[PDB]
Amino acid sequence: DPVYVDIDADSAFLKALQRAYPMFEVEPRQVTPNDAANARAFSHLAIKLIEQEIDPDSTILDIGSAPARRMMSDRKYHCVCPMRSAEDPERLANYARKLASAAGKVLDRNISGKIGDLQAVMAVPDTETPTFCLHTDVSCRQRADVAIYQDVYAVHAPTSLYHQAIKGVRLAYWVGFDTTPFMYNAMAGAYPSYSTNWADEQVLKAKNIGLCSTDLTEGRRGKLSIMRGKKLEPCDRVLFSVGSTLYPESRKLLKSWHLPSVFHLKGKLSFTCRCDTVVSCEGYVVKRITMSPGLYGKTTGYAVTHHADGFLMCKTTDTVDGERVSFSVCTYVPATICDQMTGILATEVTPEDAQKLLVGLNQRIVVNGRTQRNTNTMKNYMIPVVAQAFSKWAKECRKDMEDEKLLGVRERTCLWAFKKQKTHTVYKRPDTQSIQKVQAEFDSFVVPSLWSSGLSIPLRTRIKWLLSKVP
Amino acid sequence: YPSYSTNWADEQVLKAKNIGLCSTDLTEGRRGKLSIMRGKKLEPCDRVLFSVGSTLYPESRKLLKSWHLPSVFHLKGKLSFTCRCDTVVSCEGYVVKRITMSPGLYGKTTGYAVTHHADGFLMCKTTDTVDGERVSFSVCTYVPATICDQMTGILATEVTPEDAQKLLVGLNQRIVVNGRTQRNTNTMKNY
Amino acid sequence: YIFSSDTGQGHLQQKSVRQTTLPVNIVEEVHEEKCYPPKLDEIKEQLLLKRLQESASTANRSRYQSRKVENMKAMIIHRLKEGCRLYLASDTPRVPSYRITYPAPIYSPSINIKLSNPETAVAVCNEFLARNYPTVASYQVTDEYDAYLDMVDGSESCLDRATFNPSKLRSYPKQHSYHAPTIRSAVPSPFQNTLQNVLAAATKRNCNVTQMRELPTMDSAAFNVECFKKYACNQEYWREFASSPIRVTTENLTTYVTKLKGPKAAALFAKTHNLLPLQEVPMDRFTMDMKRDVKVTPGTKHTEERPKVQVIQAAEPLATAYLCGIHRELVRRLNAVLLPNVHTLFDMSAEDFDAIIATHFKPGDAVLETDIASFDKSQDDSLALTAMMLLEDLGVDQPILDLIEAAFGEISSCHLPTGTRFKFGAMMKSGMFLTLFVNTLLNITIASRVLEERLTTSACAAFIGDDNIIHGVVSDALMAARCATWMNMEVKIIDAVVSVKAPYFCGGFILHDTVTGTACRVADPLKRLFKLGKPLAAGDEQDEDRRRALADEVTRWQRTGLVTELERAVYSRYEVQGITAVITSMATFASSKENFKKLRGPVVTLYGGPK
Amino acid sequence: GIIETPRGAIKVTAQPTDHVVGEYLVLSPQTVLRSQKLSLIHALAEQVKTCTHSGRAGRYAVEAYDGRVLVPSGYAISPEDFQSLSESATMVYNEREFVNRKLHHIAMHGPALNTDEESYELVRAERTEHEYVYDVDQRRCCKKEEAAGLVLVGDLTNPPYHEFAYEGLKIRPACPYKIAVIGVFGVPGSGKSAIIKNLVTRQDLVTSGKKENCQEITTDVMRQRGLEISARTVDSLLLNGCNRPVDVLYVDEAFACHSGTLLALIALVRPRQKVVLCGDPKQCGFFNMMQMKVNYNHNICTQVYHKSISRRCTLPVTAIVSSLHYEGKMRTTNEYNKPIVVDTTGSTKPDPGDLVLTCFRGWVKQLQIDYRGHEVMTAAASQGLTRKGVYAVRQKVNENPLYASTSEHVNVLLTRTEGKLVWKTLSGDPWIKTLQNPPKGNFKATIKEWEVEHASIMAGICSHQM
Ligand SMILES: Nc1nc2c(ncn2[C@@H]2O[C@H](COP(=O)(O)OP(=O)(O)OP(=O)(O)O)[C@@H](O)[C@H]2O)c(=O)[nH]1
Ligand SMILES: Nc1ncnc2c1ncn2[C@@H]1O[C@H](COP(=O)(O)OP(=O)(O)OP(=O)(O)O)[C@@H](O)[C@H]1O
Ligand SMILES: [Zn+2]
């Protein structure tokens, strides 16, 4: 019954894991020094929680999953495995090798069925098999009732969900990052608890952000370019870096998963949908979607996010390829730090004073008999940018206290125009909600195409030879 | 590389004065030196000298840079393959790389390489005298994580180089917090 | 010292903070005192100095020193702040505290009685001494040749781990000028600075070795802190204090330096050119100082044996300036964790002490007074561990603890004039800036462990230095058995009864008034009486601060309803009769400048003048 | 639970099911104090106190130390025997974990450098040539159970003698045995040795005294007379189980041992005939490892004969000893004069009689650093034999509480038998009282007076009643 995770025994992330999963008990057991250990521990516990609340003897659709992970599970899985990625061949070869080595040593795991399923598919690519297929989400023609997504950011959420509901699916799950920073139209950000940094294509040559690179120079007073520019706005291309692995993503598909509370799917058949958040821990969320046939209720087109920790978004100045520009950066702040800062933001503080006080509140020296250790609450490299945000916030709130307006009227006079004030910092305190306007009515989903066999003969021969032995 | 007692330098600055691998001699200094051809240029060349302990190894830059492979790349020829590269173990300068190769040609490439820093990486401009003439170039090194964390509060204002040097000596000498058993041990090489 | 010295300066303050205008006790909140930040200004000094030359009657000079001292204070702050860059920190949110206040005291009227002829006052005092102390009144028959007699006989000493140069041991007297006293009390003159006196002072042998930091030592310390926290403290502050450390802060240094006087600031400024960093200052090196005054008590003991020589061990001047900003916070935290019926004299005045014990002591009540001076704290190493454990619980930051600990181990002392080296082991009494605090903590711990739960159920307990008084406690065999674990003379205890055997506290008497019916504390008259028979060194002009101190002390003695009680208290302590006449004699002496001149005489010069 | 007192006598019932060893109850010191029924042993409750804390963490980290009080239960005994029985059982229980913590403390933290703890090392759990070895995981002493981690060895780790006594309480008797407890007084080795040497019975076993004392009588009886008397020792007899009851028991030098231990020892064997306890009570006893004071050491006796003849071992210098330690009834016969000896600086070299035999336990460790080339061994805990030679070392003449006047440490001045006496004590001492004016009582009556008590002492063992 104990659940074992690959976390160091002295890590401070263990306490956060326990409060997020109070129905389990977690014991650390480290076997490898992976650079993204925290990002994998959460995913492991999420799968265990889902399987505990799913009715048994029911088939499950797993979209875009490596089949080597669902081998020892006692449930029924149908893996959809297209071959449009650069690391698919390794996963397929590893799955075949592990399957062959497991034959004859495991009593009841349906190993023989899996072996027969793989051989049948390799003979005819277009065949359909209960445990394996090479179609896409909109091409698979196998009926089920539960669908599971895991770290998928390459599909359109309304279009993909509609095709699943046609086959008769009434439940779905999603595991991944938090979409809220991308709804604010930010340029760069970071998730410090999981050692993840993301940035835009146009700021990859910055100097003082999480993910950048530059070089030394002397500085010249003249240089000409054919691009006038004069406009720095976010684009559709975004780079992700989790640990030491790179992932290219797109903004349009990321924002499509910020579903509203209630929405309708209208087409040949009609459905009514909902969306809830069950687990949230410092950036990772788990979502549950229910689908029913018919058309009921009314829609409002609003999305609500609940903040347990502080959320910051400020404006910074940096040099990109030698030129000084300005953009926006977002991050997360622990709740304990935010509560202890309430006293000093009642006055005006310079950035230097804020930085010094934050350092004192963060670092402590701990002695255990004769050993000495230094302990930190949050990562140190984000302190300078955070200190700037508090200084600006404390100044904007004061100005509202002298220019007091009348109650119930709008000031609009020499000309009938109203002045718009400047804003440089958005700060969301703990126990505060944010609301956004999105779309709730979806009509067109027609995306016809032709299916092409994504496989090669050299790969087919290698798999067949590997799956050739008397057991 | 201070942790493994390794120093490397370029061919053109082997006669420096205050770097890891150099040598020079005493001189009084005179007025004016007539050269043979034009200089006015100091850029890195293709020849680099390594020194591990007391052993010497010559290297070339072109072959060294060819091993910094990206995440995904394609090999096209008579046959086609798809490849990936990952970093498994990293410890203060040594890495272990794992590469998998598969037959076929399908996917997409972006042409980027990512390095994750567990310690501090530093590079700056320094002024030295090479064979009696003053020049400027760049030097890189590594810093332990503990020293970087404890210097956050001091770098909030302008600090004098002599003031910063005294603080660094005080920090390095104080980490030992002992001496009945471990005498005087330093987390940073003093040179 | 504590209440008041001979010049009326004392150690306590003069501002009341424990006074209320209601007939009941009211709990209040402790606040902070804001300090004016010093500022630098040079143009003002230049113009004021020139304007000083053209005209300066009396106040023009005073503006120059105020401007000059203010400049020095700003310079010290700028230099001192740069040294401790690795230890400086910022201000964190503070933990609030509360304190109890008491109503104002009530006093009886005073009537002044004095004689007229000052010579008759001397005769009465001399008659009093001869009748009660026959041997003391016949010692003086010639001049003061004590220095010559000390040179004729050799040098006797009992040293341990010391080195000295035998070629510099020579003690021929130098010139000595003084005024002949009129009172026949034979109070000796301060000793001369010679190598012979230094060796005589360091005739103490405390060579004892036990377990330094082993398991048996830790077990004893662990029990001691358990008794202190269980029988003398409440549990509402420990967890909050541990979370918030105490660190060196700019406000601590700014407040500290501003409180220094003129000459003290100038002396500190002279030692700021070659400013060593905080981590470079040694914490186990001391210097030896001799300049003191001999201590004499009533009785006949100084006319038969030579008194001892007092010494001072001075620490590094920079050591006591870097870290002396944390004393105020330590006092506040200690007062917060103590029980309401347990009191400490820190941060009080004379009036506040009277108001606290106004309605607690009544005639026929047993009071236990105990001192711990006669105890060898160097024998056991657990006495130092207990203090550190209490300090750690109070919330002292970890690297600062190492600096403090370095001064409680092996130390060395040096005498600059002669180059004499001394080495001492574990020592508690020193000249550092935590001496009263550690002694007070140990005094409370010893009493709590011995008395167990009898300390909790009490009316009033006061602890300061090496003296304490506890109400409603008698002497039984249980405390004797508990204290006889190692030996028997650890502490000295005395039983006192109000209105029968007056209790003694900090060189004073606790008496219960008759007209009003309240307790009060007064000074010791016999201690003053012997002090007027002390010769005055030539060239001293401090004969005006003493008259004011005597005038204040005389007025407190003549309060109605305390004359009879004072007579019985002195007789029950010293077995002497006839002190009302002495008090009257003191009254006429402190009435005018010329009346105070009758206590001196012609100037006598010895060992001087080649004629 | 409840404690019943039937008509003065006190008996305790063991109805609580808490931790009990053998037939002894375990309870907290605080419980004993808060009970007027147990007021007879309240002194021990105070002593066992001041040793109960709940650990500490930080720079100065320790572990919780809990002490308990042991009392007999189930048997109706006299109130006086209740006091002594509790002291013996309680002391053993507190002694065992004192060593256990010391070994556990060394494991977690770092051993001290300028000490003797380097004799304890960390050893792999496989190579365990040590027959018994101490483990850290369960903080006990175990032979071979695969102690995970890294196992500790040490000096006392080799024989776990502290652990060899914890199980002894299981078979420890509680009911005292009723028997005529008679005893022989006076300096030993005159007739009391000869009672068990020349006129000992068939079924008696020589188990008394130190292991050397057990064997000497066996060699003495066989060589002189015979009678095939075997030899066990007190430590083995008390720890190991007993056999066929002894007819008549002739324990010697038992007054060094604690009274409560003797009470259980007599009842564990149940002697048939009388029991005599020889060996003089005027000497050093069983001391104490933890210095804990003993207050419940009462005495049991039936006879009064004292052997006043004072053997042939004293001298005129110890006439004060005949007036300082004894009241004066110890008039001697000895013709030994030897005016006062301080061994000056260049007196008699290492020779027989000059054997280095210290009598000060706190000075034993300091003996080997200053005096190492003359002789070896110590007889402080082995006194009373026919060694006929003593020499105790000295370091200082100030603040010596270990040996002072009435202390038993000085009392070894008169050599343990008839023999030779020396002391190197400094020539010239602050005080000269013990060597200037000895009492002028009867120095020597007759040699015939000696040959009287050897028959009358036995007459009080044989002809008085049998
Ligand atoms: N932005 C983004 N993050 C991903 C993606 N896939 C996985 N991750 C996250 O990266 C973290 C670490 O990746 P891994 O668990 O090592 O992936 P894997 O399944 O073991 O196999 P590889 O991708 O070859 O390393 C996971 O916990 C995911 O949260 C993706 O496609 N896009
Ligand atoms: N339409 C789809 N339906 C089902 N699975 C898909 C679909 N598209 C991709 N996948 C699978 O999900 C994973 C993502 O494939 P993708 O083409 O996005 O790789 P990529 O180039 O590295 O881009 P990214 O880093 O955003 O994932 C692949 O393993 C793929 O098999
Ligand atoms: Zn399918």
Roughly what percent helix of chain A? 25-40%
* List of distinct ligands in this structure: guanosine-5'-triphosphate, adenosine-5'-triphosphate, zinc ion
Helix content class of chain C: 25-40%
Radius of gyration of chain A: 26 Å
Based on secondary structure, the structural category of chain C is alpha+beta
Tally of strands of chain A: 23
Report the sheet-strand fraction of chain C. 5-15%
**Oligomeric state of this protein:** part of a larger assembly
Taking the sheet with the most strands of chain A, its summary is:
10 strands, mixed
Alpha plus pi helix count of chain C = 20
> Strands of the biggest beta sheet of chain C: in what spatial order?
4-11-10-6-7
Number of extended strands of chain C? 17
Description:
This is part of a larger assembly, with 2 copies of chain A, 1 copy of chain C (611 residues) and 1 copy of chain D (466 residues). Chain A contains 11 helices and 23 strands. Chain A has helices at residues 13-20, 37-52, 88-101, 111-123, 157-166, 180-183, 251-255, 335-340, 351-362, 383-402, 457-466; strands spanning 3-5, 26-28, 59-63, 76-80, 132-133, 146-148, 171-176, 188-191, 196-200, 237-242, 245-250, 262-265, 271-274, 276-281, 284-293, 302-307, 310-320, 323-333, 364-368, 371-375, 425-428, 432-437, 441-442. The longest helix of chain A is centred in the C-terminal third of the chain and has 20 residues, at 383-402. In chain A, strands 3, 4, 5, 6, 7, 12, 13, 14, 15 and 23 form a 10-stranded mixed beta sheet that branches. A 7-stranded mixed beta sheet of chain A has the order 11-10-9-8-18-17-21. Chain A has a two-stranded parallel ribbon with strand order 1-2. Chain C has 611 residues and is α+β, with helices and mostly antiparallel strands. In chain C, a hairpin with a 2-residue loop joins strand 12 and strand 13 (467-471). In chain C, helix 1 packs antiparallel against helix 2 (59-83) and helix 2 (59-83) packs antiparallel against helix 8. Chain D is 21% helix and 7% strand. Chain D has helices at residues 29-33, 42-48, 79-108, 192-197, 211-224, 234-239, 259-269, 321-324, 364-370, 453-459, and strands at residues 3-4, 11-12, 20-21, 24-27, 69-72, 122-123, 133-134, 141-142, 151-152, 181-182, 275-276, 390-392, 421-423. Chain D has a 3-stranded antiparallel beta sheet. Chain D has a two-stranded antiparallel ribbon with strand order 1-2. In chain D, helix 3 (79-108) crosses helix 7 (259-269). The interface between A and C is small, with 11 and 10 residues. The structure holds guanosine-5'-triphosphate, adenosine-5'-triphosphate (ATP) and zinc ion. Residues 63-64, 80, 82, 84-85, 88, 136-137, 153-155, 247-249 of chain A line the site of adenosine-5'-triphosphate.
